[PDB]
Structure 1
Amino acid sequence: AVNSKYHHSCINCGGLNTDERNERGLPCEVCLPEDSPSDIYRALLERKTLKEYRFYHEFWNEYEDFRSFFKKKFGKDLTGYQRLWAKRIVQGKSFTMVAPTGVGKTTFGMMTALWLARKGKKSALVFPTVTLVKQTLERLQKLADEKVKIFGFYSSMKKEEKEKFEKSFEEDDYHILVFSTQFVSKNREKLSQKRFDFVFVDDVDAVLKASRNIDTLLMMVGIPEEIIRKAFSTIKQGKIYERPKNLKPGILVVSSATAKPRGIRPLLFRDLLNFTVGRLVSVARNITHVRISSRSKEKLVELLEIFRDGILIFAQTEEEGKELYEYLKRFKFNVGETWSEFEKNFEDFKVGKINILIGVQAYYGKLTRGVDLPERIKYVIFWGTPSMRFSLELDKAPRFVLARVLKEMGLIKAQENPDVEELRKIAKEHLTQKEFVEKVKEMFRGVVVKDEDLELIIPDVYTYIQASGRSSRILNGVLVKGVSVIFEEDEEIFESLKTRLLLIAEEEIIEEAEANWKELVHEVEESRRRSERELTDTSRSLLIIVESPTKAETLSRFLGRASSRKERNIIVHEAVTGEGVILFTATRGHVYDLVTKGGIHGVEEENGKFVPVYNSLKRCRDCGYQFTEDRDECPVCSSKNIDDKTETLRALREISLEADEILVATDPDVEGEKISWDVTQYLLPSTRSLRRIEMHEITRYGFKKARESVRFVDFNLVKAQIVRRVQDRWIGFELSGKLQKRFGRSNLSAGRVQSTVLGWIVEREEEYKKSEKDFTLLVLENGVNLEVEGKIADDVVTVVELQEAEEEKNPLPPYTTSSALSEISQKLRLGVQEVMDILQDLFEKGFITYHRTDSTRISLEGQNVARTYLRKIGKEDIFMGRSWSTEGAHEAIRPVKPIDARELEEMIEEGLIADLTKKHLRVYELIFNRFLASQSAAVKVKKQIVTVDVDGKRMGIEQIVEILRDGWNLFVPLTVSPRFEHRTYKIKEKKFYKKHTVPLFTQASIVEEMKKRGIGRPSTYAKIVEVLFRRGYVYEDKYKRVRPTRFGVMVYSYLKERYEKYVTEETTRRLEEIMDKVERGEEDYQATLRLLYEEIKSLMEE
């Protein structure tokens, strides 16, 4: 427990409670002075202070009642899906059923309607077919008790029962109504005037067929047509509609959408019932991808004798498809075809007659629209990578082919005017066929350019994935194991396919040699027979919490976001995986922060120790002002459009009641840990199952391996964060006020580091003029220019000493935050804050590792990434794996997927991936190259150290002349210089000036320095630098050099003349070091707090 207080943490009164009490699960001392009570509910009942815990107690009560009921009526207990479902149904939330078929959807609908009818509430069950009405009714009548009133309507209805139904429905007195969609579409107004408390839809597609049915259901749950028309108008407008808080709605449940939920009508559910009708898209796949070096049919047969039953073949075209058809039909295997008898052999294979079914790339990826049974297909064979081909001549080259060329050449920049004839003309005029193929193969990266057949090959990754997925699916709550074998002789196609497969599906392909066959087959058949056995349920619901929406957006992609619930201030997306359901939501920043209300600026002292007092943040969307105070209107713009984080907290606590285990996945640094604890402390009294995972990569591998290393909230990190925060608050406020005494402006001093840095710049403005010394440039004949002392007049250079050596050149270490923020803001004309934004963007999108790092460590994973890229590029021999530094928390900034920037641009042009801007791509190119250089072999060169004589003054200079063997120079350019002899050279033109020995500061220089002098940490640099500009203490110029303004110089001069002991570097580095010692648990928390308080106590009295 970190000794702190939180403003809106109490579970029962909602007021202020401490940290430890919420850590355990107890309300505040106002609600409950008892330290170790027997029961919270009972003890709060006896104190007459039970206010909000009643909701939780009765929640678990009613839920456990539901669970016992379902466990008694049905055979076994609720499953992992029905658990979340039940925990949602006792709250009265409307949602979408995200699950495969056969896990008890209809069953759960019936039992829910039965329980709710048992309580006294009336419900309705809508079905697509009348046969399902009859069946559901059948199952209900023989499981419902006599006290329940069940009625139904269908086409072939009994003579007296058909009118009995009408008479019953007319009475407005029922408990459960069961009918078709036809009934709803026909009896719109008849159903609109009734009011239910529960509605179940076993098929949402039939209902979504008409628009009037949506309004019908919304009128059935308890919403008037006027509010419906209003919301309809608002969503027609384009903006969302706030649901009236005074509205008490019913319960609507829909099965997963099979098609695409187009229309303006579905959004009504999103804005009124707080849920989206998401369609079931399951990326749940357990497929092993293996590739064979050639189209050797002998190997094919050899594998066919191992796989036996459960094989599927995909051939290039129907011609060669018929060729292989004939081949294996003549070798006497169980042959099949889907271009002639696509329906007969389908079911023949389905039963067990045919063992191997052969198809074509497009003939089966489109003509399996029936059922497509994945419990028979265990192995999918690809005879040639699924790809598209384009001829490159005069014509036949598509729009994009000429586009990418000419755009970089010089004709189509004119607002991108598309005209094929024109493309042909330009092709005739400027390019010859040779030059054309050259330029195309030069520009187009990531694809396969065949100059031989004049064909451009693009591996259809989508087709390969959709086809491969037919060997793996969630069958009876168990994800069977698939096997996909590719027969591709050309390494280029296989490599392209492998990269764009690693890009989307995040799946890899192994060579034939590194694959155990009998083992894999055994595992497949084992998964099959394990799926066949009686399903003892294992599915679970899972909750993941992130601090930024971007993260959740990029998680949804490789998780499989189907539906999206909107909970209060936040939006939580749900995805179906193999292990069960996974819920992920965004917090959008911090939740708690120190309040300036009372205490030492923000922290209250009691019993010697220090106690920070926090509160929920509110950011305005209009002006953008953030404040911790519990205001209704903004103190700046006086507008109500604020973003209260206590709403986010309450929402999260509501959601935590649904999930079984909850994981927090914030940033691996101290900030993310502080946030993680700020959340877990709030959720702890609710659900006692909270853990912490640290994702360094936002990918499948990153997520999974972050989960494999799951831990609890380390308190040292949190303590360090609190220490730094408190220091910033105290010192910042003190120096701010002391500056208010002298200049008048309110907010001035931001902290200590800011003062130190501004001091550096100010003193730099002085030590830049005095370091101005005379120099002259000397362009030498048949050599290079040479910079020397001011005034020379001998017009000759005499080489005195010359020696050559063969050194091996090692590359520069991988990008850390210092390296990146420096060299990227240098090579590009970008500010450090902007570069930091780009870095964070690349990280959260899942292209680079965690950017806030100060170590050069590289796991064998990243090394393997480098080696695999080099393997693709054809130059794997120049690879050298370097750990660089064993000690270090995070890996250095490196690309997570072996894909160069050009390949990425291609993937975006094609239409696969990104919302990536140009600067994003360039920065990624920078990191990619620096990293690969840091993972490539050393460069053998030959450098000479020449001591020349210019104007009677000996002067040495070392230079690289020749490159013996090329290594890492393929990524980072290594410059070579003309050789030097042991003779005398003539000076062509002397150029006299006086460039300063100590040049002025740049942003990259500032970062370089506060890294060098040990001031700050990766999560502060760009912030600290930007603070100077934002306050108005610093400006840039022609050379984009950092110069202090009049104001800044005045401020630092004043601070220097008065309070220097609190600004001096020797104290700043000391404090930073001590806090970093707190970060590891090597220095006391409360003690350092006491120190800060002491020096603050000293400073304040001036």
Structure 2
Amino acid sequence: AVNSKYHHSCINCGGLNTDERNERGLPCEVCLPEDSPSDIYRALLERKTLKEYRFYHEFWNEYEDFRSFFKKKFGKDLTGYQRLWAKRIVQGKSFTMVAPTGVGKTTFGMMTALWLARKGKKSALVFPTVTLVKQTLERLQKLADEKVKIFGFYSSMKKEEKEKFEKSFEEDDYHILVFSTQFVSKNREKLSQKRFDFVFVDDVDAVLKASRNIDTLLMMVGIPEEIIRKAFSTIKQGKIYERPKNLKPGILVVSSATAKPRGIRPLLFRDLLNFTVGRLVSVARNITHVRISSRSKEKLVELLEIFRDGILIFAQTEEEGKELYEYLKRFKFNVGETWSEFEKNFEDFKVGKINILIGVQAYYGKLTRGVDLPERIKYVIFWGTPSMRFSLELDKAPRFVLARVLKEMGLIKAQENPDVEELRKIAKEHLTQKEFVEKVKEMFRGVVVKDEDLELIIPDVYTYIQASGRSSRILNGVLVKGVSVIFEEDEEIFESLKTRLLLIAEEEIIEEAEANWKELVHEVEESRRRSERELTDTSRSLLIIVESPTKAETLSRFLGRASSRKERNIIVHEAVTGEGVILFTATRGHVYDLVTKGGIHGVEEENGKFVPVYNSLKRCRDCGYQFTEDRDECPVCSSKNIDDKTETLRALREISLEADEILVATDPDVEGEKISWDVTQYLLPSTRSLRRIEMHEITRYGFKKARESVRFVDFNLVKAQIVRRVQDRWIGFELSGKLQKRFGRSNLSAGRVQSTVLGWIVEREEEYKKSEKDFTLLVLENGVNLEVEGKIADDVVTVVELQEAEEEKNPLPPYTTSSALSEISQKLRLGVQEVMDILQDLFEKGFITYHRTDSTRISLEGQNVARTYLRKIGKEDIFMGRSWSTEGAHEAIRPVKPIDARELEEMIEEGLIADLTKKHLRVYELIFNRFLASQSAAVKVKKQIVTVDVDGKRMGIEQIVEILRDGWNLFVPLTVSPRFEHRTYKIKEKKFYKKHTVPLFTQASIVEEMKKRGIGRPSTYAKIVEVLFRRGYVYEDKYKRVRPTRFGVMVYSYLKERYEKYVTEETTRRLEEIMDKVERGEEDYQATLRLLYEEIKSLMEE
């Protein structure tokens, strides 16, 4: 712990508790004075302070009973899925049953109904077919005791049972009633007027077949049609509705929606039961993609001879499908078809009568609405790459083509016009067909331009992912293996497909050389027969907490958002994986912050040591003002519409009860570690299993490598965070007051570093006017311009000495935060803050590595990315992998996937991935090129050193002329220059001036400088500059240089004259150094706090 207080963190009284206690899962000292109590419930009860902890006691107990019961009555222990479901059931919550292929939902429904009836609760079990009713009642009756009233109703019911069921359902206080969906639809009013505690729906689609059934099931727990209609109007509007707080409904549990949840009705579940009926989208895949270079039917024969059984062939059209069908029929392969005898051959393949199924992209994917058995399909063969093809003529041209062409050429800026209208608008301004197709082949990167027959081929990656996916799912708890083979000869098509497959599914496609058919086939078959065996289940449920919604979005993009429980302030998404369930949600910022109320500006002091005091953050959703103090309205605009992180915290504590294991996934810096602790400490009394993962990339790889590096919270980082926060708080408050009493305004000083930097700017203005040395620029004939000492007047430049030399130039190291901010904000007309934001969205959308790094280090994986990209662009002979550094916390800012900017633009305009402005693309382009340059070979250049005489003065100038050998200059342009000859160059024009030796600052220059002096950190740079701007201390001029204003000069003059100690560069650097030492556990937390306090105490007297 870090010895600090959190205002609502008591598990039992709901009030203030210390970090150190929550860490041990204890209630506050008020609730329980004892140091180390033996049993928490017992001790709370003894002292009569037992309040909310009861809830948890009763929870755990009432669960462990269930489990026990389940383990007794049934074979063995609960599976992870059923465990999560159980834990949700004792809370009385309603939900969808998201799970893979038949994990046993009916078993859980049965044992739930049994365990409930054991107390006295009445439940209902609904099934689509009338046979499932029979079977379920069968299985029920033999395991249920005499105390359980069991009835049934279906098609082939009797002549006195049909009425028996009705009278008993009318009066006789039943326990468990098993019936069809038909009965629900038919006897709506009868059920609607009855109240069930548990309702289990096996097939949601059958019951969602009618709109009345929604209101029926809703009225089967005790909800009037008034709330239903009100909620209906609200969902007809387009926003959310809220349930009356005075409602207690039963437990409705349903399975996953097969078809898309079409209609307006299901939204009533979102408001009355707080659960969304989702569909089962599983992205869990174990597929190996191999590519063969030639469409030779001999290769296909050999392959089929290896695979032998359960093969699925896909053809471009039906013509080549039939052709291949005939060729294989002749060669004595047991084969079937989809276009002629669909069902026959399909089910004959399902049984085993057929070894090879040949279909089309259009026939199979639209007629397989029947079954699609996964335990049979091992191999998928693609006879050509699935793709959409367009025509490249003046006519027959789509929208996006003419769009990307004209927008870049001349006609379009950013606009949308009717297609044929656009054709008729370019029908006059274009030149030729040749020039058109050339513009297409030059502009469009990432696709295939068949200029031969005038065609554009775009590989359909989605279709490939689906079709390939048909060979690998989860069966009997086992993620079985599958091989996907592609027969493609055109290198452009294959490369396109591979890039977009890496972009969406992050899956690699290998070559026939690096693939052993025997081994692969073996893995496939063996995993199959491993799934055939009797299952033992080790699936666990997992909760993952991150801080920003964007991370959660892109996480849901590769984990798959099946369903989403809305829990107070937050929206927890759930996904199915091969290792179990996986829940993830976003905090939306920080949770706790330093209080302003008491002590020394929030920091209290007891027993010689300092104790930080935090309270939950509140953000007005209207004006945007943030605060810590507990108020009902916004302290500024007096509005009640606020966001309260305490609600978020409570919600998290609620979710943490379902999950077996929890992982906090905040950014890998001090800030993130602080947040992670604020959360883990709060949750720790509730859940025993809490750990930390640091994701440097937001991709499947970043996540996997994060989980391999799981750990507990590092308290030195928390301590560091705290120390800096306290310095900014104390120094900021004191200096800001001292300025309140001098310049009127209230808030002015955010800290010490800010002031230091401002000093740099202010005094830079003074040492800029003194560097004013007179100069003169000379435009030369048959050459470039030349810069020489002022006041020249001979109009004749002579050449005296002239020599040349070859040199090998290494590239610049990869971007760090300072470097990135500087160069990117310089090359673009953007501020460092804008750049920083773009970087943040870039990392959080899983496109680059962590954007806050002070290391240039690069791993084998990064070098690997560079390597594969160079091998993709052909120039792989210029690859030179460089680690760049061994001393490194994280890597440098680099791309995560070998995809350049142009390809990204292509995928964006196409619609694969979205949400990237032009600026995002440009910044990414800079990062990418810098990284590859850093991974490219050294450029060998020839430069010359020309000594020229100008009016009695010898001046030498060195310039690059020839690039004798390429390297990294392909990504980062290396400027050449016209040669000087040993003659006499005459001056054309003399532009006299006096530009200063020591120039002014720019934002880039400032970041560079404070990096160069040891002031600030990667997370603070841009924020610092922006703050300087927002406080009016500084402005930008014509050529965008940073200049101090009146106010800034006044402020730094005052501060330097009076408080020179707390603004001096030496002091700031010494403090940065010492705190950075605290971060590494080298300097003492409490001691540096003592120091800061001791200088503050001195300041509070001036």
For normalisation by structure 2, the TM-score amounts to: 0.98
Asked if 1 retains the 8 angstrom alpha-carbon contact of 2:398 and 2:419, the reply is no
Asked if 2 retains the 8 angstrom alpha-carbon contact of 1:365 and 1:466, the reply is no
Task: Give the C-alpha shift of residue 424 in structure 1.
Answer: 6.0
Task: Give the C-alpha shift of residue 874 in structure 1.
Answer: 2.2
**Residue deviations 1:441-483, cap 9 Å, x none?**
1111110111223221111111111111111011111110111
Counterpart mapping for 1:356-395 below 5 A: 356-395=356-395
**Residue deviations 1:393-452, cap 9 Å, x none?**
343333333332233334456943224376267447633222121111111111011122
What's the secondary structure of 1:199's corresponding residue? strand
Select between 852-861 and 177-186 the one with higher mean Cα deviation: 177-186
Select between 1016-1025 and 329-338 the one with higher mean Cα deviation: 329-338
Task: Give the C-alpha shift of residue 988 in structure 1.
Answer: 0.8
Q: Distance in 1 between matches of 2:507 and 2:52?
A: 48
**Residue deviations 1:308-363, cap 9 Å, x none?**
22222222222222222222222222222222222222222222232222222323
Q: Distance in 2 between matches of 1:820 and 1:270?
A: 45
Select between 661-670 and 336-345 the one with higher mean Cα deviation: 336-345
Q: Distance in 2 between matches of 1:239 and 1:299?
A: 58
What's the secondary structure of 2:365's corresponding residue? coil
Task: Give the C-alpha shift of residue 77 in structure 1.
Answer: 1.9
- Structure 1 residues 373, 763: closer, same or farther in 2, change over 3 A? same
What's the secondary structure of 1:408's corresponding residue? helix
Task: Give the C-alpha shift of residue 976 in structure 1.
Answer: 0.7
Q: Distance in 2 between matches of 1:1043 and 1:265?
A: 61
- Structure 1 residues 172, 506: closer, same or farther in 2, change over 3 A? farther
Asked if 1 retains the 8 angstrom alpha-carbon contact of 2:394 and 2:423, the reply is no
Task: Give the C-alpha shift of residue 147 in structure 1.
Answer: 1.5
Task: Give the C-alpha shift of residue 244 in structure 1.
Answer: 2.2
Select between 721-730 and 397-406 the one with higher mean Cα deviation: 397-406
- Structure 1 residues 414, 477: closer, same or farther in 2, change over 3 A? closer
Asked if 2 retains the 8 angstrom alpha-carbon contact of 1:394 and 1:428, the reply is no
**Residue deviations 1:27-46, cap 9 Å, x none?**
11111122222211111111
Q: Distance in 2 between matches of 1:299 and 1:209?
A: 49
Segments of 5+ residues of structure 1 without an aligned counterpart are none
- Structure 1 residues 97, 791: closer, same or farther in 2, change over 3 A? same
Asked if 2 retains the 8 angstrom alpha-carbon contact of 1:172 and 1:194, the reply is no
Q: Distance in 2 between matches of 1:261 and 1:823?
A: 49
Q: Distance in 2 between matches of 1:383 and 1:1024?
A: 58
Select between 1060-1069 and 599-608 the one with higher mean Cα deviation: 599-608
**Residue deviations 1:972-1011, cap 9 Å, x none?**
1111100112222111110112223222222112111111
- Structure 1 residues 267, 1037: closer, same or farther in 2, change over 3 A? farther
Asked if 2 retains the 8 angstrom alpha-carbon contact of 1:365 and 1:463, the reply is no
What's the secondary structure of 2:743's corresponding residue? coil
What's the secondary structure of 2:446's corresponding residue? coil
Task: Give the C-alpha shift of residue 951 in structure 1.
Answer: 2.0
Task: Give the C-alpha shift of residue 1024 in structure 1.
Answer: 1.0
Asked if 2 retains the 8 angstrom alpha-carbon contact of 1:756 and 1:1063, the reply is yes
**Residue deviations 1:653-711, cap 9 Å, x none?**
11111111111110001110111111111111111111111000000111011111111
**Residue deviations 1:889-916, cap 9 Å, x none?**
1111111111111211111222211111
Asked if 2 retains the 8 angstrom alpha-carbon contact of 1:723 and 1:1085, the reply is yes
Q: Distance in 2 between matches of 1:28 and 1:967?
A: 65
Task: Give the C-alpha shift of residue 59 in structure 1.
Answer: 0.6
Task: Give the C-alpha shift of residue 880 in structure 1.
Answer: 1.5
**Residue deviations 1:354-404, cap 9 Å, x none?**
222222232323222211111111111122211222232343333333332
Q: Distance in 1 between matches of 2:1090 and 2:517?
A: 65
What's the secondary structure of 2:366's corresponding residue? coil
Select between 30-39 and 492-501 the one with higher mean Cα deviation: 30-39
Task: Give the C-alpha shift of residue 645 in structure 1.
Answer: 1.1
Asked if 2 retains the 8 angstrom alpha-carbon contact of 1:395 and 1:424, the reply is no
**Residue deviations 1:3-34, cap 9 Å, x none?**
22211111111111111211111111111122
What's the secondary structure of 1:676's corresponding residue? helix
Task: Give the C-alpha shift of residue 285 in structure 1.
Answer: 0.5
Partner of 1:18: 18
Partner of 2:635: 635
Asked if 2 retains the 8 angstrom alpha-carbon contact of 1:560 and 1:577, the reply is no
Segments of 5+ residues of structure 2 without an aligned counterpart are none
Select between 1083-1092 and 550-559 the one with higher mean Cα deviation: 1083-1092
- Structure 1 residues 376, 419: closer, same or farther in 2, change over 3 A? closer
Asked if 1 retains the 8 angstrom alpha-carbon contact of 2:900 and 2:928, the reply is yes
- Structure 1 residues 422, 59: closer, same or farther in 2, change over 3 A? closer
Identity of aligned residues (%): 100
Q: Distance in 2 between matches of 1:894 and 1:414?
A: 30
Task: Give the C-alpha shift of residue 141 in structure 1.
Answer: 2.2
Select between 999-1008 and 543-552 the one with higher mean Cα deviation: 999-1008
**Residue deviations 1:45-73, cap 9 Å, x none?**
11111111111111111111111222222
Select between 603-612 and 1052-1061 the one with higher mean Cα deviation: 603-612
Q: Distance in 1 between matches of 2:742 and 2:680?
A: 44
Counterpart mapping for 1:317-356 below 5 A: 317-356=317-356
Q: Distance in 2 between matches of 1:335 and 1:181?
A: 40
Q: Distance in 1 between matches of 2:781 and 2:1025?
A: 45
Question: How many residues are treated as equivalent by the alignment?
Answer: 1102
Asked if 1 retains the 8 angstrom alpha-carbon contact of 2:101 and 2:474, the reply is no
**Residue deviations 1:253-289, cap 9 Å, x none?**
1110111112222222222322211111000110011
- Structure 1 residues 781, 325: closer, same or farther in 2, change over 3 A? same
- Structure 1 residues 414, 784: closer, same or farther in 2, change over 3 A? closer
Task: Give the C-alpha shift of residue 1069 in structure 1.
Answer: 0.9
Q: Distance in 1 between matches of 2:971 and 2:595?
A: 50
- Structure 1 residues 1063, 117: closer, same or farther in 2, change over 3 A? same
Task: Give the C-alpha shift of residue 591 in structure 1.
Answer: 1.1
- Structure 1 residues 1075, 222: closer, same or farther in 2, change over 3 A? same
Asked if 1 retains the 8 angstrom alpha-carbon contact of 2:430 and 2:436, the reply is no
Counterpart mapping for 1:940-979 below 5 A: 940-979=940-979
Select between 1072-1081 and 355-364 the one with higher mean Cα deviation: 355-364
Asked if 2 retains the 8 angstrom alpha-carbon contact of 1:394 and 1:424, the reply is no
Asked if 1 retains the 8 angstrom alpha-carbon contact of 2:383 and 2:486, the reply is yes
Q: CA RMSD in A?
A: 1.7
Q: Distance in 1 between matches of 2:1033 and 2:221?
A: 60
Task: Give the C-alpha shift of residue 1041 in structure 1.
Answer: 2.4
2:692 pairs with 1:730: no
Q: What stretches of structure 1 move > 6 A for 4+ residues in a row?
A: none
Select between 147-156 and 985-994 the one with higher mean Cα deviation: 147-156
Asked if 2 retains the 8 angstrom alpha-carbon contact of 1:716 and 1:1080, the reply is yes
What's the secondary structure of 2:941's corresponding residue? strand
What's the secondary structure of 1:329's corresponding residue? helix
Q: Distance in 1 between matches of 2:801 and 2:1079?
A: 54
Select between 685-694 and 181-190 the one with higher mean Cα deviation: 181-190
Task: Give the C-alpha shift of residue 131 in structure 1.
Answer: 2.2
Select between 478-487 and 949-958 the one with higher mean Cα deviation: 949-958
Counterpart mapping for 1:904-923 below 5 A: 904-923=904-923
Asked if 1 retains the 8 angstrom alpha-carbon contact of 2:407 and 2:414, the reply is no
Asked if 1 retains the 8 angstrom alpha-carbon contact of 2:653 and 2:683, the reply is yes
Q: Distance in 1 between matches of 2:5 and 2:336?
A: 71
2:100 pairs with 1:100: yes
- Structure 1 residues 997, 185: closer, same or farther in 2, change over 3 A? same
Asked if 2 retains the 8 angstrom alpha-carbon contact of 1:762 and 1:1049, the reply is yes
Q: Distance in 1 between matches of 2:58 and 2:1099?
A: 55
Asked if 2 retains the 8 angstrom alpha-carbon contact of 1:730 and 1:1096, the reply is yes
Counterpart mapping for 1:484-523 below 5 A: 484-523=484-523
What's the secondary structure of 1:220's corresponding residue? coil
Task: Give the C-alpha shift of residue 875 in structure 1.
Answer: 1.8
Select between 36-45 and 146-155 the one with higher mean Cα deviation: 146-155
Select between 317-326 and 555-564 the one with higher mean Cα deviation: 317-326
- Structure 1 residues 421, 770: closer, same or farther in 2, change over 3 A? closer
What's the secondary structure of 1:343's corresponding residue? helix
Select between 410-419 and 495-504 the one with higher mean Cα deviation: 410-419
Select between 153-162 and 885-894 the one with higher mean Cα deviation: 153-162
- Structure 1 residues 702, 422: closer, same or farther in 2, change over 3 A? closer
Asked if 2 retains the 8 angstrom alpha-carbon contact of 1:7 and 1:616, the reply is yes
Task: Give the C-alpha shift of residue 771 in structure 1.
Answer: 2.4
Q: Distance in 2 between matches of 1:701 and 1:477?
A: 23
Q: Distance in 2 between matches of 1:282 and 1:497?
A: 22
What's the secondary structure of 2:195's corresponding residue? coil
